[PDB]
Amino acid sequence: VQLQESGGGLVQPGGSLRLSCAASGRTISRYAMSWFRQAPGKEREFVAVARRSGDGAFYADSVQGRFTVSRDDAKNTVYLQMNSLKPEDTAVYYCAIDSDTFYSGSYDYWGQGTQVTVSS
Amino acid sequence: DIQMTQSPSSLSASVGDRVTITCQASQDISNYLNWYQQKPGQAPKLLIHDASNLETGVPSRFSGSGSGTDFTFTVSSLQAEDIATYYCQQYYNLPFTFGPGTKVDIKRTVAAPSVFIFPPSDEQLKSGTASVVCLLNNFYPREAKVQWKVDNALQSGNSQESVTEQDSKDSTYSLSSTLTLSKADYEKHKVYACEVTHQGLSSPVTKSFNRGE
Amino acid sequence: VQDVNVASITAFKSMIDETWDKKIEANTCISRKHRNIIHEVIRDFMKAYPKMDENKKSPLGAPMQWLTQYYILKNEYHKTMLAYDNGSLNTKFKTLNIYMITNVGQYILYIVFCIISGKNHDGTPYIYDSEITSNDKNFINERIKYACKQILHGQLTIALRIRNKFMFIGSPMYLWFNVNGSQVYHDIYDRNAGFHNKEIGRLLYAFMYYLSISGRFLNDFALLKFTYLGESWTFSLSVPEYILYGLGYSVFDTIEKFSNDAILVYIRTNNRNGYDYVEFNKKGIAKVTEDKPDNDKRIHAIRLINDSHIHFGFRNMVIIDNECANIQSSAENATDTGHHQDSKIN
Amino acid sequence: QVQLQESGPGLVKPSETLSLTCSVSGGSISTYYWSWIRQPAGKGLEWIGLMYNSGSPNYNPSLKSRVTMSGDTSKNQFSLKLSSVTAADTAVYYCARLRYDFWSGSKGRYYMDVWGKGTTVTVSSASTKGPSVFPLAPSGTAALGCLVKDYFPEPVTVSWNSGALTSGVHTFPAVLQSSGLYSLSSVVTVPSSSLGTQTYICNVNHKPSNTKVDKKVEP
């Protein structure tokens, strides 16, 4: 099972981006999908999680109201719409599968990560 | 007697959302229905009488309606302090009967747990038993996993967990895991670790100590 | 054109003089003569201006003609009353308030003059003149509920300070417009533990407890219906004297029966320390053809005999005892003895 | 100011009689209607019976033979007696004031608006046992607490610094160990700079055994 991500890039402060993460070998419909980011010299912090359809999406304080996480179970792909971008959002964004269907956060399989840079 | 049903059995909503609870009666009870709010650790508090009349002092965000068999309870703008179990009760016939209740939970942003471990206190070892307590403090969502490893050996069937009710201010949860060991088995090992996973944690968080050290 | 009964004004003025210096003791109660006077003053006050003017009516149906200054000031009974004997009763009244009352004359004069002037104990009127034609049902209901509640609550404040047990003047029936008697009962007693005392305001308790368990309009469950000047009231139990005296109803009003149950309509006292009554059985209008007794002997009480709360009809509580200390106000001390002293008139 | 408070033995042997008392302040019991309501742990509410101001009781037909309710005017209390108890009677018992309304139909309208704090009663053949209190010593923000182990039956009240320390306290619900004895822990998060400056004492209280323990937690 592999997680390929894309959509990163350089943006002016206040711009918007849409990240994507396609999955292979396994169906994401039964597992929750989380988004993490890592700025240089910091730990990998939580951004958003997209549980199974109907179980809701949850966000972090730093990204609440600006980011929206969604999923396309038919295409085995999850997304992260990023609006009102600020330089503090510059990091490498990863996507992980919660291997536990009970939502305990057993992040076994991760993506390669894509770079998001916000600067003028 | 007259039997009451409530739907849903539980629900999770964010602050500001419009929440609606339904209550059904097995027969016509006109508007002889009460609505109670029971916050954790308290007695039931009467909010609405006669299906739609608010009690004195109840916030205006609470409202109710209905007459006959089906009844509706609505919180127009859900607040964090409203975490409770809401019951409906009929007084049309004796005996008075309550509904099964609806649990209203608050949805908030993700907060990772702060993990702490506590070795057994020297006083307890004199009893022949050792209790290792692991603490998960103020986290959301409620789902979390706790694993005990003594000398890097995963434990099973020798620990008990306890979760607090949702907090009425920051809407978080707290979990404890107590590993109970005999003094004999406790002294045979050195490192006692508590591994915690949570959806807000990218990698499992481990807190451990060394016996004596 | 207005019907002004000057006799009740003279009897009231005499009653104040004879009682202006009588200190209210622990068991002091208002005599039958004085109650019948008080009962007649309020009823005569309403009949002076019985209806509202067609061009200044309440769309809610509230009896604004007895609640607002616009109608009370041109009420010829109110005008004659406040000016009687060089306005001496008005001079005495202007010196009284709830917290200084100590004598019977002060108690009676202050409570009654507030009612026939449409004034609350804090000086505010029951209903403002601008609210006569008001369509705000909830707002008008609160004001009428406040006036009705405060009449009973104010007397309980007096009874608690004096430690009196049986002084009682009721809220007349028209002040119960949309008022929930069960609410008034719980509102007052939940808010002052002193009123629960076994020696404090017993006739006030008996009046409010009865109204807390029997609503004004019982609809299909109604057995009796009183009506006076358009103000109606229904009953399904026996009607003790403190209910008819408190609400201001007379046994000579429009009494209507909706069942074949037998009722004993006490109307007067007799020379053998008993009570003369008239019995009715059939459905329809129960008209008392007897002469209306004077203030010394008049009685307003009904004992209901139902065979389908019975203590309300017991002889010694359905009629207020003349001995103030022997007045019964609860089922615990309710006795039904002495029927051989009464007499049937039919 | 109507206020209610339940009281009674927290332990009752099977087949024996449960006895509870509700003390009323701020008004006479002869003024209102009253009712008993019980709620087992984690379950719903069951109406036991009502009592009118005349003392006449009306019981739930489910318990219509085992219950007796009576009033004491001299003490301003009313009691609840439940005979032949089983495990199904282990619950938290509440007494409440039953406000009534008879001005919207002959069918009375009844509301339980004033509730007591409730009392916990456990039906068991075991004997009461006091708890053992052990400190959870700490090692920006630090965590410390107390371990209330091996007691029976419920409940146990835990406070910190005699009620001075309230914010940040988490007293977990008790767990039933395989020995039949309950066990809980109460924790609190404090600033790291106060571990040597501020003194922290937990106040464990177990009514069924008359056990009050004040334990000092220190690094």
mmCIF file of C-alpha atoms in Angstrom, chain B residues 6 11 13 32 49 62 66 72 79 86 94-96 104 122 138 140 144 154 168 171 177 187-188 198 205:
data_model
loop_
_atom_site.group_PDB
_atom_site.id
_atom_site.type_symbol
_atom_site.label_atom_id
_atom_site.label_comp_id
_atom_site.label_asym_id
_atom_site.label_seq_id
_atom_site.Cartn_x
_atom_site.Cartn_y
_atom_site.Cartn_z
ATOM 1 C CA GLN B 6 -35.793 8.980 22.290
ATOM 2 C CA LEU B 11 -25.005 12.790 19.092
ATOM 3 C CA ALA B 13 -22.277 18.643 17.549
ATOM 4 C CA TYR B 32 -48.126 16.139 29.333
ATOM 5 C CA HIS B 49 -42.695 21.523 31.226
ATOM 6 C CA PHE B 62 -33.587 25.771 24.664
ATOM 7 C CA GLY B 66 -45.059 18.707 20.159
ATOM 8 C CA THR B 72 -39.214 17.706 19.751
ATOM 9 C CA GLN B 79 -22.967 25.657 24.051
ATOM 10 C CA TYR B 86 -31.474 14.842 28.034
ATOM 11 C CA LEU B 94 -49.411 6.783 36.324
ATOM 12 C CA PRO B 95 -46.727 5.548 36.718
ATOM 13 C CA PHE B 96 -44.583 8.444 35.495
ATOM 14 C CA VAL B 104 -25.330 15.365 23.704
ATOM 15 C CA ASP B 122 6.610 3.118 48.638
ATOM 16 C CA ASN B 138 -7.200 16.765 28.312
ATOM 17 C CA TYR B 140 -10.084 15.153 21.982
ATOM 18 C CA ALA B 144 -7.138 6.606 22.302
ATOM 19 C CA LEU B 154 3.458 -6.044 25.886
ATOM 20 C CA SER B 168 -17.979 21.568 30.370
ATOM 21 C CA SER B 171 -14.747 19.897 25.990
ATOM 22 C CA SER B 177 -4.754 3.210 32.915
ATOM 23 C CA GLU B 187 10.634 -6.525 41.379
ATOM 24 C CA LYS B 188 11.617 -8.950 38.594
ATOM 25 C CA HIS B 198 -4.049 9.190 19.446
ATOM 26 C CA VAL B 205 4.180 8.773 22.758
#
